[PDB]
Every structure is written in structure tokens, then in C-alpha cells.
PDB file of C-alpha atoms in Angstrom:
ATOM      1  CA  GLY A   1      -0.141   0.255  -0.152  1.00  0.00           C
ATOM      2  CA  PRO A   2       2.033   3.371   1.005  1.00  0.00           C
ATOM      3  CA  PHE A   3       5.930   4.122   1.729  1.00  0.00           C
ATOM      4  CA  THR A   4       8.145   5.026   4.082  1.00  0.00           C
ATOM      5  CA  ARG A   5      10.453   8.174   4.048  1.00  0.00           C
ATOM      6  CA  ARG A   6      13.093   5.304   3.613  1.00  0.00           C
ATOM      7  CA  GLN A   7      11.313   3.092   1.193  1.00  0.00           C
ATOM      8  CA  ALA A   8      10.328   6.050  -1.321  1.00  0.00           C
ATOM      9  CA  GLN A   9      14.718   6.610  -0.603  1.00  0.00           C
ATOM     10  CA  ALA A  10      15.026   3.335  -2.521  1.00  0.00           C
ATOM     11  CA  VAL A  11      12.720   3.475  -4.955  1.00  0.00           C
ATOM     12  CA  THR A  12      14.049   6.391  -6.367  1.00  0.00           C
ATOM     13  CA  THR A  13      17.883   5.598  -5.553  1.00  0.00           C
ATOM     14  CA  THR A  14      16.675   3.178  -8.000  1.00  0.00           C
ATOM     15  CA  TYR A  15      14.232   5.219 -10.732  1.00  0.00           C
ATOM     16  CA  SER A  16      15.667   7.951 -10.570  1.00  0.00           C
ATOM     17  CA  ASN A  17      13.053   9.096 -12.416  1.00  0.00           C
ATOM     18  CA  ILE A  18      10.846   9.528  -9.306  1.00  0.00           C
ATOM     19  CA  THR A  19      11.441  12.503  -7.236  1.00  0.00           C
ATOM     20  CA  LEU A  20      10.543  13.347  -3.434  1.00  0.00           C
ATOM     21  CA  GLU A  21       8.696  16.988  -3.172  1.00  0.00           C
ATOM     22  CA  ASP A  22       5.862  18.380  -1.340  1.00  0.00           C
ATOM     23  CA  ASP A  23       7.699  17.395   1.857  1.00  0.00           C
ATOM     24  CA  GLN A  24       6.725  18.516   5.141  1.00  0.00           C
ATOM     25  CA  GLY A  25       7.846  16.272   7.390  1.00  0.00           C
ATOM     26  CA  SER A  26       5.611  13.230   7.223  1.00  0.00           C
ATOM     27  CA  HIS A  27       3.351  14.459   4.675  1.00  0.00           C
ATOM     28  CA  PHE A  28       5.004  14.445   0.944  1.00  0.00           C
ATOM     29  CA  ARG A  29       4.261  12.934  -2.243  1.00  0.00           C
ATOM     30  CA  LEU A  30       6.928  11.040  -5.098  1.00  0.00           C
ATOM     31  CA  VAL A  31       6.789  12.694  -8.375  1.00  0.00           C
ATOM     32  CA  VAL A  32       7.422  10.237 -11.308  1.00  0.00           C
ATOM     33  CA  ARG A  33       9.056  11.978 -14.659  1.00  0.00           C
ATOM     34  CA  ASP A  34       9.826  10.759 -17.603  1.00  0.00           C
ATOM     35  CA  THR A  35      13.362   9.559 -19.253  1.00  0.00           C
ATOM     36  CA  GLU A  36      13.126  13.911 -19.423  1.00  0.00           C
ATOM     37  CA  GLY A  37      11.825  14.961 -16.232  1.00  0.00           C
ATOM     38  CA  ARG A  38       8.493  15.621 -17.395  1.00  0.00           C
ATOM     39  CA  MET A  39       5.526  14.948 -14.445  1.00  0.00           C
ATOM     40  CA  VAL A  40       3.447  12.092 -15.725  1.00  0.00           C
ATOM     41  CA  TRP A  41       1.662  10.932 -12.217  1.00  0.00           C
ATOM     42  CA  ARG A  42       2.576  12.549  -8.283  1.00  0.00           C
ATOM     43  CA  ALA A  43       1.051  10.282  -5.490  1.00  0.00           C
ATOM     44  CA  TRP A  44       1.045  10.699  -1.767  1.00  0.00           C
ATOM     45  CA  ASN A  45       2.801   8.747   1.119  1.00  0.00           C
ATOM     46  CA  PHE A  46      -0.352   8.564   3.377  1.00  0.00           C
ATOM     47  CA  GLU A  47      -2.142   7.112   0.784  1.00  0.00           C
ATOM     48  CA  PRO A  48      -3.639   3.527   1.684  1.00  0.00           C
ATOM     49  CA  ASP A  49      -2.213   2.007  -1.806  1.00  0.00           C
ATOM     50  CA  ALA A  50      -0.163   4.832  -3.020  1.00  0.00           C
ATOM     51  CA  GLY A  51       2.134   1.954  -4.568  1.00  0.00           C
ATOM     52  CA  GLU A  52      -1.127   1.183  -6.621  1.00  0.00           C
ATOM     53  CA  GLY A  53      -0.367   3.929  -8.866  1.00  0.00           C
ATOM     54  CA  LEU A  54       2.795   4.391  -8.656  1.00  0.00           C
ATOM     55  CA  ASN A  55       3.873   0.277  -9.213  1.00  0.00           C
ATOM     56  CA  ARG A  56       1.364   0.873 -12.156  1.00  0.00           C
ATOM     57  CA  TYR A  57       3.801   3.372 -14.019  1.00  0.00           C
ATOM     58  CA  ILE A  58       6.592   1.103 -12.458  1.00  0.00           C
ATOM     59  CA  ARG A  59       5.408  -2.033 -14.196  1.00  0.00           C
ATOM     60  CA  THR A  60       8.430  -3.720 -12.806  1.00  0.00           C
ATOM     61  CA  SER A  61      10.373  -1.662 -15.832  1.00  0.00           C
ATOM     62  CA  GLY A  62      10.489   1.699 -14.509  1.00  0.00           C
ATOM     63  CA  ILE A  63      13.506   4.051 -16.192  1.00  0.00           C
ATOM     64  CA  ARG A  64      16.017   2.113 -14.590  1.00  0.00           C
ATOM     65  CA  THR A  65      17.364  -0.679 -16.665  1.00  0.00           C
ATOM     66  CA  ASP A  66      14.185   0.207 -19.340  1.00  0.00           C
TER      67      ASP A  66
END
């Protein structure tokens, strides 16, 4: 479902197309960008299943190795 500040870092360490913004402590959202860095999808942290939408972008491919 949702993630943590630590988890976020790990997913963004993996996918540099992700970005941690709107940081207010525990209130923040990850901005999924494309290869260029265009905003494709930004999802919060405290969302019951934030990972649901994020993983749909990821599709176990991501912009990592691609």
C-alpha cells in the first residue's frame, strides 16, 4: 500500500525518474517523471495504496534499466 521516507528513497535511488517533493515531514509525495523529467504522475505517502498507482507506472520495468 503506502510507503515510508526510507522506502521512497530506495525506489528513487532505483528510479531516478522519481522525485520526493512537497516534503512537510511525513506529508510528502513522490513525483514520477519520464526519461526527460516531465511530470507523469505524483502520488502522496499517506495514501492507503499509493504504491498501486506508482507500481502501475513502474510495471517492473521503470526508467532504471528500461
